[PDB]
Amino acid sequence: APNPKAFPLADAALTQQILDVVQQAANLRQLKKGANEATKTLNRGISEFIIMAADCEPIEILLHLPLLCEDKNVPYVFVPSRVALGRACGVSRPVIAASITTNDASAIKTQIYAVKDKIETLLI
Amino acid sequence: HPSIRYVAHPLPEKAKVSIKAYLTQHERKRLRRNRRKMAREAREIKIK
Amino acid sequence: QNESTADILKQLPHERLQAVLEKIPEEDLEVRRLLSILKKPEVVENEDVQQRRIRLAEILMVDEIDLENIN
């Protein structure tokens, strides 16, 4: 298992859907990669939801975020592989945390609310 | 009738999903450039 | 004559790949299954079936391994 600590962690199918939204919003410029820009989106409050990586090491550097996500009441999930995550973000270098941000004019908004809803299902 | 002496630990009972691998605009441009380079050199050397 | 057109043409990298594309059967589950076993990415961002077959060909070309060698 990808660490005992990191929670929640989606399955292969929902991971596939979430990564699909990652690539899509990445094509719509509605995504912000990286832990620092994820943190910036959380502080600004424009973040729809946070994706993070399970296989990353060390895990703590991604474990600073869940506290901030629970503070701002924003959903977050853990895709298993940072290589697949950044690969979906469109960067060869593996990305650990990505953030789907808010756009009122976005065409994928409904997709973001559906995936976000399933994320809130996972959160517990 | 049941056994008090011991404690059972039975049946740790337990779906393939196609992995879609996206990739960069750099590897899309590089990929198309390589494919069209193969077809282009194939038609050029072939017609040569 | 020396360096026959068949030898140069088969030596050409694209056509040498096209000869391998003729050796691979075209099926969704079989083409997909060979990628799954081969550990290469099973599906890429957006591809037609023929393009997935082309990825088969390319991967068999770069790795220098054939279908009979895999299975």
Side-chain angles (χ1 to χ4, degrees), chain A, chain B, chain C residues 2-71:
Chain A
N3 297 131
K5 296 168 66 180
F7 179 83
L9 190 144
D11 61 10
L14 177 61
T15 296
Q16 183 62 62
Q17 187 174 356
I18 294 170
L19 295 177
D20 180 67
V21 178
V22 168
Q23 179 60 258
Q24 187 64 260
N27 291 337
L28 273 66
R29 297 295 180 191
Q30 194 171 356
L31 185 147
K32 300 295 181 65
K33 292 173 292 297
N36 295 132
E37 293 178 352
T39 300
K40 290 191 294 184
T41 56
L42 291 173
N43 294 131
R44 292 171 64 88
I46 63 172
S47 177
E48 289 298 322
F49 57 88
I50 302 300
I51 301 102
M52 287 180 276
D55 287 343
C56 60
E57 294 302 322
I59 187 65
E60 295 301 323
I61 61 171
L62 280 73
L63 289 175
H64 77 285
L65 289 174
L67 276 67
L68 176 60
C69 297
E70 294 176 351
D71 288 344
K72 298 293 180 64
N73 191 30
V74 175
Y76 63 93
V77 286
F78 295 154
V79 295
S81 178
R82 66 181 182 275
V83 176
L85 173 62
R87 185 66 65 183
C89 296
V91 173
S92 296
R93 181 63 180 163
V95 177
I96 52 104
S99 177
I100 304 299
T101 60
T102 298
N103 189 340
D104 56 353
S106 178
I108 65 172
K109 186 189 295 178
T110 60
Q111 187 174 357
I112 295 172
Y113 292 152
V115 172
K116 180 179 178 180
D117 182 67
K118 186 68 180 296
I119 293 171
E120 293 177 350
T121 294
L122 293 179
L123 289 175
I124 303 300
Chain B
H1 187 279
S3 178
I4 294 170
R5 296 286 294 173
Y6 298 96
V7 173
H9 299 82
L11 295 176
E13 183 179 2
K14 295 176 179 177
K16 293 177 179 178
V17 175
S18 63
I19 296 171
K20 291 180 68 66
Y22 299 132
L23 58 86
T24 63
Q25 186 174 355
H26 295 83
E27 293 179 351
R28 287 175 294 180
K29 180 179 75 179
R30 180 171 294 104
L31 178 63
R32 177 178 180 271
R33 182 178 64 83
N34 287 283
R35 293 182 181 175
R36 291 178 64 85
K37 183 186 291 179
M38 295 297 103
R40 181 176 65 85
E41 293 179 351
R43 292 181 294 102
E44 181 66 15
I45 301 301
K46 182 181 293 295
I47 194 167
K48 182 178 179 180
Chain C
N2 59 344
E3 292 89 0
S4 178
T5 61
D7 290 344
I8 295 171
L9 181 64
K10 184 185 292 180
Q11 185 62 59
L12 189 147
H14 181 199
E15 295 302 320
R16 184 181 63 195
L17 183 146
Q18 185 62 58
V20 176
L21 189 147
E22 295 302 321
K23 295 176 180 177
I24 192 68
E26 182 177 1
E27 294 86 358
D28 291 344
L29 295 177
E30 294 181 352
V31 164
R32 181 182 295 176
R33 180 179 180 273
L34 293 173
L35 292 173
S36 64
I37 295 170
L38 182 62
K39 292 181 69 66
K40 302 303 287 185
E42 182 175 1
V43 176
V44 181
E45 54 182 342
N46 187 337
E47 63 182 343
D48 189 6
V49 176
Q50 288 82 359
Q51 293 178 336
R52 183 173 293 106
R53 181 177 181 171
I54 294 171
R55 296 186 301 104
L56 290 175
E58 293 179 350
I59 295 168
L60 297 177
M61 293 300 295
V62 176
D63 192 10
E64 188 65 14
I65 184 168
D66 289 343
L67 178 63
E68 297 303 321
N69 290 336
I70 293 172
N71 62 344

